[PDB]
Amino acid sequence: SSQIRQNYSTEVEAAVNRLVNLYLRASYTYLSLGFYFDRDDVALEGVCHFFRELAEEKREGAERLLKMQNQRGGRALFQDLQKPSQDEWGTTLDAMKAAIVLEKSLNQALLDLHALGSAQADPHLCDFLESHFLDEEVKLIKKMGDHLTNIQRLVGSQAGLGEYLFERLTLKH
Amino acid sequence: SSQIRQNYSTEVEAAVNRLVNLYLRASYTYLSLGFYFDRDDVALEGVCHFFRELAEEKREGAERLLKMQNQRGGRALFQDLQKPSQDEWGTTLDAMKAAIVLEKSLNQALLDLHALGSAQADPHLCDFLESHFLDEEVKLIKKMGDHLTNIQRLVGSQAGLGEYLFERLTLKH
Amino acid sequence: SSQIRQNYSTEVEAAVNRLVNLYLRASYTYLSLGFYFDRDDVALEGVCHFFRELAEEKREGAERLLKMQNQRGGRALFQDLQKPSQDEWGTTLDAMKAAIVLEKSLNQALLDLHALGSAQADPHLCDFLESHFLDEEVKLIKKMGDHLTNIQRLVGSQAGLGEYLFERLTLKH
Amino acid sequence: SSQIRQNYSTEVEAAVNRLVNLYLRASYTYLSLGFYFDRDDVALEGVCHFFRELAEEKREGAERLLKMQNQRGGRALFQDLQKPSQDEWGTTLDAMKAAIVLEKSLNQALLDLHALGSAQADPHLCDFLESHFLDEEVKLIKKMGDHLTNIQRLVGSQAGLGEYLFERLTLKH
């Protein structure tokens, strides 16, 4: 039941629902990452705040996709959200590597959906993805790559020292 | 060495580097145009300022392309910048004709790169070019065409008079 | 064609044109340096901003020289701008060493032109160079020497750590 | 009688007095030029104001020289001020040509005095001349050359029309 649907394929509708699941799973992963760094035996609050902000960003992305689904006359369908891949996330370096792997997976899912939009001649969809998602992914992944490089440079030698300094001097408070 | 590169072809990376060279060459051409109109034996300051503003715009375009190259994980490679095609630029009319030829050449290079982006299924690139470059080119070329028409209308008959009036009454101070 | 030229030798006019080329080449070199430090596998943004500011300063110096050329009745002549001497710039230390070598070369070119001005009894030229260029070079070179010393002190031992700390704690954001 | 004179030659003292006479004569010439353009049968007020401003500038230059003469312990000596070379100044073009000839003569007198300062190892004098006079002359002469070119471009054909337009659209009110 929709009186508005136009040029919106069932394939795209389904892929949008899958992307919502991916974004919510990413949000959940970042929630876990954030709280891990808030453990009293980890205690790197700049890292807590970095991942918590990302958890909010991914939730907002899911909600944007859902708003779009309804604007086009598609129907939201939700699936179980699988728990994050790890319970403990290791070092800041380990975490930032996991985060980049995650973002690349989201980016590829966006690219896949854009390709589907192109195949389906759905310019509203393809533009929607670029404006709210594809640009943001490129920016985020560059930031994460920058952070990885700085973390790596700081290892040495004296990993504890480097981990503290990165959190204090790069990450925001 | 990049930990971020995704869906960014070597072909696109190379074409972006070439486009940077084209934008810097255009900036250099406009620098020459601007100072020519500041000669005491030319002395058309509205024309100086018009071309100097364009020199800044083209430099900014090059820097935007370079920022994008790094955001995608490509590697900037710079080449020699060839000197402008002329040392003396003739009349305002001659100059404006040269400027339009230049802008059309930049526009075609942007269109060529967009086509490559399309062939390579690189929507981030294609959107980047449209947002920061393709729209601006259309606007600029329309402005230049408008100016050419006004300059042409003012020739007569009394070319000196017309050249002065255009600079005084159309171009900004 | 000039109705204004007075006490301005052909030798000085030519040397001013050469100096414009040197300043533009320096600007181009700093543009390359800046973007190298913005690479995701380098990621030292304080260093990016340091060199980008210098690129702007050198471009402004070229434009000042060109304005002066026209004020004196000389004629700007532009030459090809050779690409920077390197595509990759190594460490912050390597880069700062290259920058000092570059500035000393500009300074010597200014000194050479001042000497020519003196030989030609051209006090407007000699004063112009001192006011806008010679003072600024001394200040800049002292700053670079200061930075080199601080970078060198930070090597150790733990070069990665030192490189990060210099960028965080000395260079501006 | 002076208790302050140091490194200030009689040659320089005399040349400064001569330069005062030249500046006052220039001021007087511009006073005549200004009022000529205020004649009801000439009536080009932008031109009146242009020359009257120059009359003030030249008077101020004379006073600066006189202040300097006393600061150095030299003694002002005034001579008769010869009347301007013409009673009627022809067209704006004629006037602007006369003005440039006048400024070049002042500039050469400044250059001559700077050379004397150099020969006499009098750096206070040479710097004084550059700061307050040599820079200002270059700027003024460039402005006059610019105006001459614009006036010349406007002749045609229709000289009356061009003369009116220059006064209305270039000169200030």
HEC profile of chain B? CCCCCCCCCHHHHHHHHHHHHHHHHHHHHHHHHHHHHCCCCCCCHHHHHHHHHHHHHHHHHHHHHHHHHHHHCCCCCCCCECCCCCCCCCCHHHHHHHHHHHHHHHHHHHHHHHHHHHHCCCHHHHHHHHHHHHHHHHHHHHHHHHHHHHHHHHCCCCHHHHHHHHHHHCCCC
In Å, how far are A5, A52, A58 from A55, measured between CA atoms?
Answer: 31, 5, 5
Query: CA D50 from chain center: how many Å?
Result: 12
Our CA angle for D111, D117, D121, nearest 5°, is 145
Can you spell out the DSSP letters for chain D?
--S---S--HHHHHHHHHHHHHHHHHHHHHHHHHHHHTSTTT--HHHHHHHHHHHHHHHHHHHHHHHHHHHHT--------PPPS-S---SHHHHHHHHHHHHHHHHHHHHHHHHHHHHTT-HHHHHHHIIIIIHHHHHHHHHHHHHHHHHHHH-TT-HHHHHHHHHHHTS--
Which tokens in the block code for residue B85? 């095609």
CB burial readout A74-85, b (16+ within 10 A) else e: beeeeeeeeebe
Report how far residue A43's alpha carbon sits from residue A163's, in angstroms, rounded to the nearest whole number: 11
Which tokens in the block code for residue C87? 């595509």
Return the CA Rg of chain A.
18
Q: Do A165 and C160 touch (CB under 8 A)?
A: no
Report how far residue C31's alpha carbon sits from residue C102's, in angstroms, rounded to the nearest whole number: 13
CB A142 within 8 A of CB C35: no
Report how far residue D137's alpha carbon sits from residue C41's, in angstroms, rounded to the nearest whole number: 54
Q: Do C78 and B40 touch (CB under 8 A)?
A: no
Determine the 3-state secondary structure of C81 from DSSP: strand
Chain C: nearest CA to D135, how far in angstroms?
7
- Asked, as a colleague might, if the bond just before B131 is cis with ω within 30 of 0, I would say no
Which tokens in the block code for residue D114? 């700077």
CB A36 within 8 A of CB A42: yes
Q: Do C4 and D130 touch (CB under 8 A)?
A: no
CB B89 within 8 A of CB B97: no
CA-closest candidate to residue A118, choices B123, B113, B8: B123
Determine the 3-state secondary structure of A157 from DSSP: coil
Which tokens in the block code for residue D106? 């002042």
Determine the 3-state secondary structure of A171 from DSSP: coil
CA-closest candidate to residue A16, choices A78, A69, A79: A69
Chain C: nearest CA to A111, how far in angstroms?
22
Amino acid at site B168:
R
CB atoms within 10 A of CB A134: 23
Main-chain phi, psi angles of B81, to 5 degrees = -100, 115
CB C20 within 8 A of CB C78: yes
In Å, how far are C117, C142, D11 from D120, measured between CA atoms?
Answer: 19, 34, 9
Determine the 3-state secondary structure of A82 from DSSP: coil
In Å, how far are A46, D7, D164 from A56, measured between CA atoms?
Answer: 16, 76, 68
In Å, how far are A22, A54, D141 from A48, measured between CA atoms?
Answer: 22, 10, 66
Measured N-to-C along each axis, helices C159-169 and C135-154 cross at an angle, to the nearest 10 degrees, of: 140
Is the sign of the CA dihedral A169, A171, B3, B7 positive or negative? negative
Which residues are CB-neighbours of A22 under 8 A, at least 6 positions away? A105, A106, A109
Report how far residue A86's alpha carbon sits from residue A97's, in angstroms, rounded to the nearest whole number: 13
Beta pairing partners, B81:
C81
Long-range (24+ apart) CB contacts under 8 A made by D136-139 are D136/D57, D136/D61, D137/D103, D137/D106, D137/D107, D137/D110, D138/C71, D138/C72, D138/C124, D138/D107, D139/C71
Question: Which structural technique was applied?
Answer: X-ray
Main-chain phi, psi angles of D122, to 5 degrees = -120, 80
Which residues are CB-neighbours of C36 under 8 A, at least 6 positions away? B76, C42, C88, C89, C95
- C142 lies in which domain range? 1-173
| DSSP symbol at C132 | I
Breaks (C-N over 2.5 A) in chain D follow: none
Which tokens in the block code for residue C111? 């000194």
| DSSP symbol at A131 | I
CB B20 within 8 A of CB C35: no
CA-closest candidate to residue B129, choices B5, B1, B3, B23: B23
How long a stretch of residues is chain C?
173
Interface partners of chain A (CB pairs < 8 Å, 3 or more) are B, C
Amino acid at site B9:
S
Q: Residue A116: how many CA atoms within 13 Å on its side-chain side?
A: 19
CA-closest candidate to residue D98, choices D80, D107, D85: D85
Q: Residue B84: how many CA atoms within 13 Å on its side-chain side?
A: 24
CA-closest candidate to residue B33, choices B73, B106, B101, B90: B90
Which residues are CB-neighbours of D32 under 8 A, at least 6 positions away? D84, D86, D87, D89
Q: Do B160 and D158 touch (CB under 8 A)?
A: no
Q: How buried is residue C156: exposed, middle or buried, by Cβ count under 10 Å (0-12/13-18/19+)? A: exposed
CA-closest candidate to residue B10, choices B128, B134, B129, B120: B120
Which residues are CB-neighbours of D13 under 8 A, at least 6 positions away? D69, D72, D74, D75
In Å, how far are B88, D5, D81 from D64, measured between CA atoms?
Answer: 41, 18, 18
Report how far residue D157's alpha carbon sits from residue C162's, in angstroms, rounded to the nearest whole number: 74
Which tokens in the block code for residue B136? 């601006």
Interface of B with A (CB under 8 A): 2-4, 6-7, 70-73, 121, 123-124, 127
Report how far residue D62's alpha carbon sits from residue B140's, in angstroms, rounded to the nearest whole number: 51
Cross-chain CB nearest to A156 (options C40, C158, C168)? C158
Per CB-CB distance under 8 Å, the chain A contacts of B4 are 100, 141-142, 144-145
- Asked, as a colleague might, if the bond just before C157 is cis with ω within 30 of 0, I would say yes
Q: How buried is residue D10: exposed, middle or buried, by Cβ count under 10 Å (0-12/13-18/19+)? A: exposed
Report how far residue B49's alpha carbon sits from residue B30's, in angstroms, rounded to the nearest whole number: 10
At how many Å resolution was this determined? Answer: 1.7
Q: Do D153 and B164 touch (CB under 8 A)?
A: yes
Q: Do D115 and C124 touch (CB under 8 A)?
A: no
Which residues are CB-neighbours of D56 under 8 A, at least 6 positions away? D27
Main-chain phi, psi angles of D156, to 5 degrees = 70, -140
Number of folded domains that form chain D: 1
Report how far residue C92's alpha carbon sits from residue C98's, in angstroms, rounded to the nearest whole number: 10
Residue with tokens 């035996």: A41
Pick from C35, C36, C39, C40 the residue to mutate for testing the A interface (most A CBs within 10 Å). Answer: C40
Residue with tokens 């009116």: D164
Report how far residue D25's alpha carbon sits from residue D86's, in angstroms, rounded to the nearest whole number: 13
Pick from B1, B4, B130 the residue to mutate for testing the A interface (most A CBs within 10 Å). Answer: B4
Q: Residue C30: how many CA atoms within 13 Å on its side-chain side?
A: 23
Q: Which residue of C has its CA nearest to B83?
A: C80
Beta pairing partners, C81:
B81
CA-closest candidate to residue D58, choices D9, D8, D111, D99: D99
Q: Do D170 and B168 touch (CB under 8 A)?
A: yes
CATH code of D70's domain: 1.20.1260.10
Main-chain phi, psi angles of C81, to 5 degrees = -100, 115
Which tokens in the block code for residue B27? 């900036």
Report how far residue D158's alpha carbon sits from residue D155's, in angstroms, rounded to the nearest whole number: 6
Report how far residue C66's alpha carbon sits from residue C62's, in angstroms, rounded to the nearest whole number: 6
CB D103 within 8 A of CB D61: no
Beta pairing partners, A166:
none
| DSSP symbol at A120 | T
CA-closest candidate to residue B43, choices D36, D79, D151, D123: D151
